[PDB]
Design a protein around this ligand. Structure first.
Ligand SMILES: Nc1nc2c(ncn2[C@@H]2O[C@H](COP(=O)(O)OP(=O)(O)OP(=O)(O)O)[C@@H](O)[C@H]2O)c(=O)[nH]1
Ligand SMILES: CN[C@@H]1CCc2c(ccc(O)c2O)[C@H]1O
Lengths: 235, 284, 334, 50
């Protein structure tokens, strides 16, 4: 009779009240995705990020009272990538000191993967944060004269350092040329398309660098600010 | 027979104000996609302009055309109270929208936590209450009436409808209605412009080789120019003819007030240019 | 032995062509058309914080379960629109759900490569995980119940398996696909089932024998949905090249195609009617279409959603149609 | 090795004409069209969702 319906409405109110509390946490958190080729250093960045601030691999950390949630999904023909169309940013890790290794060249495989990711039907809004990992190996490779980049890449012969290229403190002129060559090689694909909806942020990363989390925080803040500015047509 | 044409033009003003605001009202409520925090402020502004066009303008047009007031003294006082209420409650919403945008852009991480539906409703209620406290109370309690003999004869006559106030009430109403929101709006939009310029400079410094703040300039300029050019000239004479009498003729006063009126009709064009709004309008 | 394999392939096409007396359209040309079918929304369920990827009706056709990627599993009640349960999930990436024929258990799965079972009808009034099934090496795509103790799951490692809930072990496994498996559907008598893969092929497995029987081809891209005819002697397939096809088990060949030149979007789900006369299929263009099984004539469009449709289901009594989308709203049409 | 033996099983199976299958499906649809609420709308007095 009507006695049963009286208790049924009580169950709805308890559940509906609980959903309100869970909405606040969900709306006040940021999700990130880790991508990259194998043997690049994805887990190495995770270990440093996890320890300092606290199937599938997930990580929770907090910076400046802001909730952050990072997950790693770790195989061509990716069908599951359509789910990650609402994340704040995509973190791309590439080993820049592996141009001479074949498994074609590993760097060329990374470029192909990045180009495939950039021009995707679902990822037409999500920005990309790019980490050029393993810098000291590349510096050591360039410092000694052997296995020149021109041998594996022919465009390196007709490349010169850009005018607005800030050198590293005390770095030799040879390593900077190769570093910025690789950086613009990745940036060309990003600037070739996009229509201003998403941008790419490059960085130079090592295994011992500790300022990575600050870079991620600043880039996320800039991404959100630019999204709001574009929405208000104030850019 | 110039007046007969002057009637024709005015009627278009009344119809345009009513027609423009009703589309904004129906689209927001009918469609659940558009129900956001800022759309509540937009709905409040649209409702205020709707009340303007429905109640205030037609009676003023009738008074201008017939050169007499047939309703009576109580109804003319009520009409003046409604006019002040709806003018005061329409300007103060623009300041709310400006502050909302400032919070959204300057501090994006705390924007989600700071403002919710409850705070938005509280702010809207507070704005409407403050606007009501300025118009109905000082008018119905008879604290604004002047002292000179012409004003006394005007109040005594039941077929005359004019507006006479002393210095204190005119200054207080002007300061509460127009001057205070202006400085806040200017500061807010200057800060937003600086933030946009900084972001554009950073983008240019990042990938300038592979690829100046005109969009932000135009977007801010449209709003500031329209609001100022609409409501600035009126709120100068309003104090000018009160501090020193016998400087401004009446026709100037009515012309400036009616010029300030049309901002109510111009607002929806400015504040409903979103692609979702265009899609909703095309659907209807 | 490469040349030997191709020799048998040519023989199959020879026998298949010999049995094609006439097309399905020619025989059913004199059937009076159904006309125009229009239905209106009766209920709208709210309370999901993110997109919706799964849905399944109950046997009583009154209670249904929905899964979302915000980490929730809400059990509704369509008659009165009241939430009855809300199970928190350990993993926020969920791609499938199911409801027991007896109504006592509910399953789940996703990118964690693990299937989970919850015991609804338990003492002390608290739902808890009853069993976790592990052994797959790819994300789960679908799962269906046979009885209270058996379940069939298909994963993204080109395999399908049959489990035992009491012991949590694989009774048997099915192999042969060269691509990711996307969906499945059991027979009315629960003795056979199909599976649509990403290599543009479908098979017909046998549960008791554990080996493939037939293979059907014809699509030009991935397969995203599958469903049996109410009779049990035919099934329909839905791919992401804007085509639907009706296959036949006994005739062993494609029968009829449901395609339109004005549609260029993919298909996410298909379902039949109570009498097997209408074929409802979702689409990526934010709405759903209703077909005709024997005529390939569109007979109505359901366009009440603000995002893509990801799931679709019809009650056992054939009284309502429930759809889900990426705007976190369910709708019941009648 | 294993692949070549698979098509051997599926090569030798019993098949029937398309016309018989089409007749069977159309007969089933015609027979069961009566008790289909979606094809023939039910009276509003017996509609649970109304
Ligand atoms: N010397 C040196 N080694 C590095 C550096 N960065 C990463 N590595 C090597 O990377 C190894 C671990 O990273 P990976 O091989 O990419 O394995 P992972 O971190 O799990 O990442 P994935 O292989 O993509 O799953 C370590 O043992 C290091 O030897 C670096 O900057 N300097
Ligand atoms: C007759 N119309 C009135 C006159 C004075 C006045 C207006 C609006 C806002 C104010 O703060 C005012 O003092 C006008 O709408």
């Amino acid at each position: 009779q009507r006695n049963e319906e009286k208790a049924q409405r009580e169950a709805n109110k308890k559940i509906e009240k609980q959903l309100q509390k869970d909405k606040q946490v969900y709306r006040a958190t940021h999700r990130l995705l880790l991508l990259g080729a194998g043997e690049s250093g994805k887990s190495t960045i995770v270990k440093q990020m996890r320890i300092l601030h606290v199937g599938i691999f997930e990580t929770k950390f907090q910076v400046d009272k802001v909730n952050f949630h990072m997950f790693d999904v770790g195989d061509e023909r990716r069908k599951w990538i359509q789910c990650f169309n609402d994340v704040t940013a995509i973190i791309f890790v590439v080993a820049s000191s592996s141009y001479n290794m074949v498994i074609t060249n590993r760097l060329q495989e990374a470029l192909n993967l990045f180009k495939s990711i950039w021009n995707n039907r679902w990822l037409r809004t999500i920005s990309v944060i790019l980490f050029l990992n393993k810098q000291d190996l590349l510096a050591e490779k360039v410092l000694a004269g052997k296995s020149k980049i021109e041998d594996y890449f022919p465009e390196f012969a007709r490349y010169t350092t850009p005018e607005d290229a800030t050198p590293e403190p005390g770095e030799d002129p040879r390593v900077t040329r190769a570093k910025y060559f690789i950086r613009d090689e990745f940036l060309r694909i990003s600037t070739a398309s996009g229509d201003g909806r998403h941008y790419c942020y490059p960085h130079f990363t090592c295994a011992v660098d500790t300022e990575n989390i600050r870079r991620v925080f600043n880039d996320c803040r800039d991404i959100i600010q630019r999204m709001h500015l574009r929405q208000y047509e104030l850019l | 027979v110039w007046v007969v044409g002057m009637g024709i033009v005015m009627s278009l003003i009344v119809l345009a104000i009513v027609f423009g605001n009703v589309l904004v009202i129906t689209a927001i409520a009918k469609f659940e996609r558009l129900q956001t925090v800022t759309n509540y402020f937009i709905t409040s502004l649209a409702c205020a302009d709707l009340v303007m066009g429905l109640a205030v303008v037609p009676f003023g047009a009738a008074h201008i055309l017939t050169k007499t007031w047939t309703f009576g003294n109580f109804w003319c006082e009520f009409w003046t109270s409604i006019d002040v209420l709806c003018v005061t409650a329409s300007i103060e919403t623009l300041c709310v929208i400006a502050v909302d945008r400032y919070f959204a852009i300057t501090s994006p991480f705390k924007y989600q936590s700071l403002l919710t539906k409850n705070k938005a409703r509280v702010i809207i209620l507070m704005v409407w209450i403050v606007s009501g406290l300025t118009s109905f109370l000082p008018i119905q309690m008879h604290w604004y009436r002047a002292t000179h003999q012409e004003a006394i004869n005007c109040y005594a006559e039941e077929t005359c409808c004019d507006f006479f106030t002393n210095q204190a009430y005119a200054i207080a109403s002007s300061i509460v209605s127009f001057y205070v929101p202006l400085v806040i709006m200017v500061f807010v939009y200057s800060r937003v412009f600086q933030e946009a310029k900084r972001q554009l400079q950073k983008i240019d410094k990042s990938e300038g080789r592979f690829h100046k703040e005109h969009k932000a300039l135009k977007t801010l300029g449209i709003i500031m120019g329209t609001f100022t050019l609409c409501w600035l000239p009126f709120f100068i004479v309003n104090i000018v003819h009160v501090i020193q009498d016998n400087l401004i003729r009446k026709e100037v006063y009515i012309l400036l007030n009616w010029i300030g009126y049309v901002n109510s009709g111009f607002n929806p064009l400015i504040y409903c240019r979103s692609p979702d709004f265009r899609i909703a309008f095309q659907e209807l | 032995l490469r040349q030997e394999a191709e020799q048998l392939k040519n023989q199959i096409r020879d026998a298949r062509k010999a049995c094609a007396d006439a097309t399905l359209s020619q025989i059913t040309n004199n059937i009076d058309p159904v006309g125009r079918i229009q239905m209106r929304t009766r209920r709208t369920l709210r309370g999901h914080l993110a997109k919706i990827y799964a849905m399944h009706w109950g046997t009583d056709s009154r209670l249904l379960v929905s899964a979302s990627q915000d980490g929730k599993l809400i059990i509704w009640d369509s008659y009165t629109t009241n939430k009855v349960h809300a199970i928190p999930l350990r993993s926020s990436w969920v791609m499938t759900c199911a409801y027991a024929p007896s109504g006592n258990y509910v399953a789940c799965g996703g990118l964690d490569n693990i299937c989970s079972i919850y015991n609804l009808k338990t003492r002390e009034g608290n739902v808890r995980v009853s069993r976790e099934l592990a052994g797959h090496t790819g994300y789960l795509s679908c799962c269906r119940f046979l009885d209270d103790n058996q379940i069939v799951t298909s994963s993204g490692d080109t395999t399908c398996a049959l489990w035992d809930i009491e012991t949590g072990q694989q009774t048997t496994t099915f192999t042969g696909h060269t691509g990711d498996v996307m969906s499945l559907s059991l027979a009315p008598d629960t003795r056979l089932f199909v599976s649509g893969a990403c290599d543009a092929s479908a098979k017909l497995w046998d549960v008791r024998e554990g080996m493939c029987r037939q293979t059907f081809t014809g699509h030009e891209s991935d397969i995203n949905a599958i469903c049996f005819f109410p009779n049990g002697n035919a099934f329909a397939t839905g791919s992401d090249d804007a085509t639907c096809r009706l296959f036949d088990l006994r005739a062993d060949q494609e029968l009829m195609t449901y395609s339109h030149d004005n549609i260029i979007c993919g298909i996410t789900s298909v379902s039949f009617s109570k009498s097997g006369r209408l074929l409802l299929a979702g689409y990526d263009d934010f709405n759903c279409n209703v077909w005709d099984a024997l005529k390939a004539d569109r007979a109505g469009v359901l366009a009440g959603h603000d995002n893509r449709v990801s799931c679709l289901g019809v009650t056992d009594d054939g009284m309502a149609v429930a759809t889900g989308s990426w705007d976190s709203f369910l709708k019941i049409w009648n | 090795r294993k692949l070549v033996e698979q098509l051997k099983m599926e090569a030798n199976i019993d098949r029937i004409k398309v016309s018989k299958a089409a007749a069977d499906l159309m007969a089933y649809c015609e027979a069961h069209a009566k008790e289909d609420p979606l094809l023939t709308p039910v009276p509003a007095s017996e509609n649970p969702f109304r």
